[PDB]
Every structure is written in structure tokens, then in C-alpha cells.
Amino acid sequence: GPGTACLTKALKDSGDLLVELAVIICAYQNGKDLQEQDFKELKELLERTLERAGCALDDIVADLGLEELLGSIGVSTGDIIQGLYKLLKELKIDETVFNAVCDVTKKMLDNKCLPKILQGDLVKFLKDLKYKVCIEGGDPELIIKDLKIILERLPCVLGGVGLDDLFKNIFVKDGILSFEGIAKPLGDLLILVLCPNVKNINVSS
């Protein structure tokens, strides 16, 4: 249908749609003890994300067939998410990218980052890491400074460790960033998870 058609083309366009959808889908699927307002905001984010790509969620829901009669007034967001996920696989999306984004999203939820995922801030975070942190030929003192600015806007990823104490434990050592003491979990997340993800995806600054 028109909704699936629009989505199909939109995924082939230069943009962040696949990554953004993966975040939304995996947040819905993995979030723990989600509030009703969380579910409402996730749907609003899906609607907005599709609109920005030139598509309408209503059209997609029509094509998923969720709107016939059925045993409810309205369509459940869970059904939309599961339908959308199945549809994406039918459209042969890059599941390597999808799964890598999904795994990252899971880790960010475990750090209580949902309120910021809801604000659409996660893709922004990956963009900043891609161009300011996970880079080649960078000045490590400058990278430390840039990381400080970035994390200050997404403090949930610090996992309760204050920014000030975290950076008491981040040093240049032998030309590479060194994450010592209480900063080691953050360093692991960057080095093992986030930097490989942002190198994998193509996304604008």
C-alpha cells in the first residue's frame, strides 16, 4: 500500500530513518516497567520520525491491516511496533545495522536513558561521537574535552557517576584515552560498543 511504498523509498534515501526506527522499536520491546506516558511518547516519536521522512504512520497502520474491526477501539502501539518490525525485515533492511543499534539501545535503557531516547536525543549522541570522539588522527586532549561536553548533555549514560569524578579518572596514557577506576565502565561502553556502532552507520554531522 501507499504507506509501505513510502516507507520502502524512504529507507533508500539518504537519512537516519532505519537507525531511528531501530531505536524506537527496541526501546518499546526492551523498556522495563514503562509508564503509560512512555508508551504515548514512543508513539509520538514514531509518528514524528515517519513524518520527517515524508511518510504517515496512519498509512503504514492501514497497510499492516491493523484497522479493520478487531477487538479494540484504536490500534495498540505494541501491534504497530511488531508489525513495523516484521515489515522492515520483509523490506530486507540491513539487519547488521538494525541489530547493532538495537543492542546499543538496550544498553542505554539499562542506564536509565529512556527520557532522552524519547526526546530523540540518541541519534544526536551517535552523531557527536562519530565526528568528535571515535575519530582517526585526533588530539586525545581535545577528544577528552569534546567527550566532556557530549556526556554533559546525556548524563544518564554516566550511570550515576558524577561527571566531575568520572573525568578525574580519564587520562591520556601513551597516546590513547585511558579510562581508570570508576570511569572504566564508560570507557568499555565507548570502546567496545559505541565507537564500533558509529563507525558502522552512515549518518550526517
User: How many angstroms is the resolution?
Assistant: 1.6
Among 51, 42, 19, residue whose Cα is nearest residue 126: 19
| DSSP 8-state class, residue 44 | H
C-alpha cell at 24: 524506537
Integer angstrom CA distances of residue 6 from 12, 22, 27, 43: 10, 18, 23, 19
Cα–Cα distance for residue pair 174/154, rounded to 1 Å: 28
Instruction: Supply the DSSP symbol for 45.
Output: H
Dig out the grid coordinates for 104 from the structure.
546499543
Q: Could you tell me the three cell numbers for 156?
A: 544518564
* Helix, strand or coil, per DSSP, at residue 172: strand
Q: Which of 186, 198, 199 is nearest to 155 (CA)?
A: 186
* CB 81, CB 28: distance < 8 Å: yes
Give the whole-angstrom CA distance, residue 57 versus residue 40: 14
Question: Cell numbers at residue 28, please?
Answer: 518499546
Rg (CA), the chain: 19
Closest CA to 122 of 98, 157, 147: 157
Which experimental technique did the depositors report for determining this structure?
X-ray
Is residue 137 within 8 A of residue 154, CB to CB? The reply is no
For residue 199, give the 3-state DSSP assignment.
Answer: helix
